[PDB]
C-alpha cells in the first residue's frame, strides 16, 4: 500500500490543486516522465495542506514539480500515520436564518414567502443602513420619511419603498437571498427577537 | 556613486526570463536635476525643500528593452525610453545639485549663504549626514593568534570580487595548537572544518609534488618543509578528486543524498563561494591553488617566527566607507527587490496567457521609500530585517556653531560595540599621524571609538585596476598561470588589490617606473599606492576605495622639488590659472596613504632637518608641509596647544562644539529648531594660522574679555 503524506498548500486553493495534478498526470502519462503518484485527497475543512498517496518521497518530489500551490511543501513533506488513511475519508456535519455576507451578517431574519424556484427566499431584516447620512451599523427600525427627505436613490409606493443597494422594503425589508447565502439551521431566535418580530 | 556605481549596478544585474518567455534587459540610465510637481516640473530649491518639509531628491530614468519570445518564432524586442524607477536623494553642492557652479551672488540671491559646506542630504526637511564607518580591509591575508581556543594561528582572508550581491564571505586557514600542529581550513557554507591537503586534492592536484611546489617555494630549509608533514600524513586516504569532493560534500550545509549530488554541490561551492576575488571564471584552479598556497606559506612563516603577526589597530589594514559605498550597498538590495517585483507581476500574467504592461510592473515606491527611510532613520538595512544591520549611520546635522557643523561633516566611526572592556581599539595608535586628530574625541562611553579627520587627510575614491594590469603585462612581469614554480624563490611577488597577479624579476626598476609614472600622473592616478617590501620580496598595489591618504612634499637627494618659481606662481593664482592641481601635476607633492607611509623617510621641516650635520639618516624621501596640519577642525582653533596638558585639548575640542555664535550667515531665513546666536561675536585677538581656512574670522563664537586671575 502506498503511503499518505501532507504537502503544504495555499489556504483556500487546495480545491484546484487536485484538478491541476489530474491535468498534469493526463498530460504526462503519454510522455517519458509520467506522474507516478497513486492518489491525492483533499478534505472538506482541512486548509493549508493536502494529502498525497504515493510510495516514496522521490516520486512526489518529482511529481509536484512546477506546482506553485505546493511550493512551500515542495522541499519537505511530513509522514501521515498509517492508521489515519480511513480517518482521512471521514466527513461530519417560516423559519429563521442568518446571512453569511454583506452588512446584514449574523442577523436574525424571518422568512416571508418561499419561492418554489429553489434559488432564493425572502427574509425579514432589520435595516442596517445610516439613511445615506454618513457614507458618501446597529439594528434599527426603518424610517420612511427620513429617507424620503434625504432623497437620492429612493422610490416610494406607499409603505413599499425602494432604496439604494437593491433592497426591497415594506412597512421592514423584503429581499430574496440565495439559500446557500443563508444558514437555515442553528439560529433559535430568543424572546427579545420574538418581540422584535428544563 | 552617482556617475559610476548606479550604472554598474543596474547593468550587471542578470536579466529575468520566464511556453512564452521574455528577456527585459536594462541599459544606460538617465538622471535629471531635482524637481517637484498635477503641476509642471519645476526646479526645487534646497531652501524651499527645507521649509516645506520636502525631500531634496532627483528622479531616476532607465532604458529598458523588452524581448518576449514564444513558440512559432514570435519574438518582439520592444524597448521603452526613460521609464521612471524612483527618486534618488541628492547631496548638496554635488554635481547633480542645483547649487553647483553658482556664483556667491546667485547663492545670496537664493537665500543660501556661500559658506555652507554642503555634503548633507535633506530628508523630510531635516539635514542628514552620512557618518563614515570603518571596516577591516578585504582581499588581504592577515595572520592573528587567538590563544584561547584550539588554534594557535589563523590566516583569515576576506574576499569580495566587485560589488557582489552576497556580502563578503570569509576564509580561514588555521593551525591546531595541541605530532600535532595540523593545518586545516574553514570553508564557507561548510558546517565543519576540513584539513588542507583534502582541499588541494579537491582542486584536482592528485600529485604530491605539485602541492608542495604551490606551498613551499624553496626546498632547502628543513624546518619549513617538515611542518607540513603533520597535516600531510593526516591526509593519505584521499587521493582522487571525486573522493575529495564527496568528503567535502558530506559536511555541507545541505549535504546531498547521492555521490553525484555531493560532488556537484562541493564543486559548485568551491567554484563560486570560495575566493571570488581571485576570479569566478570558467576555471580558476591555476590561481586559486596559488592563493591557498600563499595563505599556508604565510601561516608557516608566522609559525616559524620569520614574520611577525599582523596588527588589527593599524589603519593600513582598514577602509573607510563614505556615502558612495553605503548608498551602493542599499541600492543593490533596493534594485533586487524591484527586479523580483516586476518578475512576479509578469509571471502573474504570462501563466494565464495574458500580456503584461511594464509600466504597472515597476513599483517606484519601494526604491524611493527604502532610500528615504534608510537615510532618515539610520537603520542601514531593509526595514523588516534591520536587526542584522547597523544603526546610527545617518544622524541629524548638528547646526549649533560652525565648527560643530564642520566637525560633524568629517566624523569617523568605529563599529566596535560599546560596553566593551577592550582598550586596544580605543588607544591612540602610532599610525594615526596626519590622518586623525590626536585630540578631538568624545569622553563618554564612546571614547576612542569616534574619530575626526585631520585637516589635510583625504579619502581615496577608488579606480578600476585595468590600466595597471595592462601596463604590468606590457612590462617585464611574467603572468601567474604560465610561470615555473622553481622561479618563485629568486623573484618578487606582485599583488594588485590583494589579488596575486604574476611575478617580476627586477623589483627596483619596476618600483621606480611606477613612482615616476604616478608623479607624472599619466596612467596611474595619484590615488594609487605602491608598497614594496624588502624583507620578503613582495610588491603591493592598491586602487580600491576607502584608503586614507595625505599629501606630502618630495625630497630628491637632500633638497626639495618645491622651488621659488612654484611659490611665485602660486602667489598669483587669481591671475594665473596655476592651482594646487598644477602643483600635483609637476610631481612636487605626492599623496601618501598609511601603508606607503610605512616605508618612507619623513622630514619634519626642510630648513632644519635637511642641513648637513653628523648624518642621522641623510636619506629623506619626503617632507611634512607643516607639522601643525595634523590636528582636526576643532583642535586647530586652540592657541598654543603644545603648551597644554593633553586632556585639556580634548576637553576644549569637546566644548568647542557647544559655544554659541553666528552658526550660519542666513540664520534669519531658516526655521531651525533650537537656534542659538550671540549678539556681538568677535574674532580672537590671538589666532592660529589654521583657522583662516575654517572661516572662523567670519562666523566667530566668543568675545575677547579682560580676564584677571585672582
Amino acid at each position: 500500500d502506498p503511503n499518505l503524506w501532507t504537502v503544504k498548500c495555499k489556504i483556500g486553493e487546495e480545491r484546484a490543486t487536485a484538478i491541476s495534478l489530474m491535468r498534469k498526470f493526463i498530460a504526462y502519462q503519454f510522455t517519458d516522465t509520467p506522474l507516478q503518484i497513486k492518489s491525492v485527497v483533499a478534505p472538506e475543512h482541512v486548509k493549508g495542506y493536502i494529502y498525497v498517496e504515493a510510495y516514496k518521497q522521490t516520486h512526489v518530489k518529482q511529481a509536484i514539480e512546477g506546482v506553485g500551490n505546493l511550493r512551500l511543501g515542495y522541499w519537505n513533506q511530513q509522514m501521515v500515520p498509517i492508521k489515519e488513511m480511513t480517518d482521512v475519508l471521514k466527513v461530519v456535519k417560516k423559519s429563521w436564518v442568518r446571512l453569511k455576507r454583506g452588512i446584514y451578517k449574523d442577523d436574525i431574519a424571518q422568512v416571508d414567502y418561499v419561492e418554489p424556484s429553489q434559488n432564493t427566499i425572502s427574509l425579514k431584516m432589520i435595516p442596517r443602513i445610516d439613511y445615506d447620512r454618513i457614507k458618501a451599523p446597529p439594528q434599527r427600525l426603518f424610517d420612511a420619511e427620513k429617507i424620503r427627505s434625504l432623497g437620492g436613490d429612493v422610490a416610494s409606493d406607499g409603505d413599499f419603498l425602494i432604496f439604494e443597494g437593491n433592497r426591497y422594503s415594506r412597512k421592514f425589508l423584503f429581499k430574496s437571498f440565495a439559500m446557500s447565502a443563508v444558514i437555515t439551521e442553528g439560529v433559535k431566535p430568543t424572546l427579545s427577537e420574538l418581540e422584535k418580530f428544563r | 556613486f552617482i556617475q559610476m556605481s548606479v550604472q554598474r549596478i543596474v547593468e550587471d544585474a542578470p536579466p529575468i526570463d520566464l511556453p512564452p518567455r521574455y528577456l527585459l534587459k536594462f541599459e544606460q540610465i538617465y538622471l535629471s536635476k531635482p524637481t517637484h510637481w498635477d503641476g509642471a516640473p519645476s526646479p526645487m530649491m534646497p531652501n524651499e525643500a527645507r521649509l516645506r518639509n520636502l525631500t531634496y531628491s532627483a528622479p531616476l530614468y532607465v532604458d529598458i528593452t523588452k524581448t518576449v519570445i514564444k513558440e512559432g518564432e514570435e519574438q518582439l524586442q520592444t524597448q521603452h525610453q526613460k521609464t521612471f524607477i524612483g527618486k534618488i536623494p541628492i547631496m548638496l553642492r554635488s554635481t547633480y545639485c542645483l547649487l553647483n557652479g553658482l556664483t556667491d551672488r546667485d547663492l545670496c540671491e537664493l537665500n543660501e549663504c556661500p559658506l555652507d559646506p554642503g555634503g548633507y542630504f535633506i530628508i523630510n526637511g531635516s539635514e542628514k549626514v552620512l557618518i563614515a564607518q570603518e571596516k577591516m580591509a578585504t582581499n588581504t591575508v592577515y595572520v592573528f593568534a587567538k590563544k584561547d581556543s584550539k588554534y594557535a594561528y589563523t590566516g583569515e582572508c576576506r574576499s569580495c570580487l566587485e560589488n557582489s550581491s552576497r556580502p563578503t564571505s570569509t576564509i580561514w586557514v588555521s593551525m591546531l595548537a595541541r605530532i600535532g600542529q595540523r593545518i586545516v581550513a574553514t570553508l564557507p557554507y561548510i558546517k565543519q572544518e576540513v584539513p588542507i591537503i583534502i582541499v588541494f586534492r579537491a582542486l584536482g592536484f592528485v600529485s604530491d609534488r605539485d602541492i608542495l611546489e604551490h606551498i613551499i617555494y624553496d626546498f632547502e630549509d628543513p624546518e619549513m618543509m617538515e611542518m607540513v608533514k603533520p597535516s600531510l600524513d593526516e591526509a593519505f586516504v584521499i587521493q582522487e578528486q571525486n573522493v575529495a569532493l564527496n568528503f567535502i560534500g558530506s559536511r555541507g550545509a545541505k549535504p546531498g543524498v547521492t555521490k553525484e549530488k555531493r560532488i556537484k554541490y562541493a564543486k559548485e561551492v568551491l567554484q563560486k563561494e570560495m575566493l571570488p576575488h581571485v576570479g569566478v571564471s570558467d576555471f580558476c584552479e591555476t590561481k586559486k591553488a596559488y592563493f591557498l598556497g600563499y595563505m599556508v606559506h604565510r601561516l608557516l612563516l608566522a609559525a616559524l617566527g620569520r614574520r611577525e603577526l599582523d596588527d588589527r589597530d593599524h589603519y593600513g589594514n582598514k577602509r573607510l566607507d563614505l556615502a558612495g559605498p553605503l548608498l551602493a550597498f542599499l541600492f543593490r538590495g533596493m534594485f533586487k527587490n524591484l527586479l523580483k517585483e516586476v518578475r512576479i507581476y509578469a509571471q502573474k500574467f504570462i501563466d494565464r496567457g495574458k500580456d503584461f504592461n511594464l509600466e504597472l510592473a515597476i513599483k517606484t515606491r519601494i526604491i524611493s521609500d527604502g532610500l528615504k527611510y534608510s537615510l532618515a532613520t539610520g537603520n542601514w538595512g531593509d526595514q523588516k530585517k534591520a536587526h542584522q544591520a547597523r544603526a546610527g549611520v545617518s544622524q541629524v546635522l548638528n547646526r549649533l556653531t560652525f565648527a560643530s557643523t564642520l566637525s560633524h561633516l568629517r566624523r569617523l566611526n568605529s563599529p566596535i560595540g560599546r560596553d566593551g572592556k577592550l582598550a586596544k581599539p580605543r588607544q591612540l595608535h602610532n599610525t594615526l599621524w596626519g590622518m586623525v586628530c590626536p585630540a578631538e574625541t568624545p569622553e563618554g562611553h564612546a571614547v576612542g571609538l569616534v574619530k575626526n579627520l585631520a585637516l589635510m587627510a583625504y579619502i581615496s575614491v577608488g579606480s578600476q585596476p585595468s590600466p595597471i594590469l595592462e601596463f604590468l603585462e606590457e612590462w617585464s612581469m611574467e603572468n601567474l598561470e604560465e610561470i615555473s614554480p622553481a622561479a618563485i624563490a629568486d623573484a618578487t611577488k606582485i599583488f594588485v588589490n590583494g589579488c596575486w597577479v604574476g611575478i617580476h624579476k627586477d623589483p627596483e626598476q619596476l618600483m621606480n617606473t611606477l613612482r615616476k609614472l604616478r608623479r607624472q600622473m599619466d596612467i596611474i592616478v595619484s590615488e594609487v599606492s605602491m608598497i614594496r617590501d624588502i624583507r620578503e620580496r613582495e610588491i603591493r598595489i592598491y586602487t580600491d576605495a576607502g584608503r586614507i591618504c595625505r599629501p606630502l612634499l618630495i625630497v630628491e637627494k637632500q633638497k626639495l622639488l618645491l622651488k621659488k618659481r612654484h611659490i611665485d606662481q602660486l602667489k598669483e593664482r587669481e591671475y594665473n590659472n596655476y592651482s594646487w592641481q598644477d602643483l600635483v601635476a609637476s610631481g612636487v607633492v605626492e599623496y601618501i596613504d598609511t601603508l606607503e607611509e610605512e616605508t618612507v623617510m619623513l622630514a619634519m621641516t626642510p630648513d632644519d632637518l635637511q642641513e648637513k650635520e653628523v648624518a642621522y639618516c641623510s636619506t629623506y624621501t619626503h617632507c611634512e608641509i607643516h607639522p601643525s596640519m595634523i590636528l582636526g577642525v576643532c583642535a586647530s582653533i586652540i592657541p598654543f596647544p603644545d603648551h597644554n596638558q593633553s586632556p585639556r585639548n580634548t576637553y576644549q575640542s569637546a566644548m568647542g562644539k557647544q559655544a554659541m555664535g553666528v552658526y550660519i550667515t542666513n540664520f534669519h531665513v531658516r526655521m531651525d529648531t533650537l537656534a542659538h546666536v550671540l549678539y556681538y561675536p568677535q574674532k580672537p585677538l590671538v589666532t592660529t594660522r589654521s583657522m583662516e581656512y575654517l572661516r572662523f574670522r567670519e562666523l566667530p563664537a566668543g568675545i575677547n574679555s579682560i580676564v584677571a586671575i585672582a
Partner: protein, 48 residues
C-alpha cells in the same frame, strides 16, 4: 481547537493545533526561548 476536535476529530490537525496553543501560551509568559521563533506583531518588533 475546541470547535475542531468537537466535530472533525482528525487526530492529526489536533496535534498541530495543540502545539500552536502550547507555543502561544509559552510565549505569553516568556519571549526569549532557545530554539524557538520570536513571537512578534506585524510591526517588525517582538512582543514583550
Amino acid at each position: 481547537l475546541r470547535r475542531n476536535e468537537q466535530n472533525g476529530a482528525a487526530a492529526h490537525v489536533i496535534a498541530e493545533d495543540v502545539k500552536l496553543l502550547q507555543f502561544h501560551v509559552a510565549t505569553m509568559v516568556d519571549n526569549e526561548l532557545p530554539g524557538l521563533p520570536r513571537a512578534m506583531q506585524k510591526s517588525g518588533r517582538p512582543l514583550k
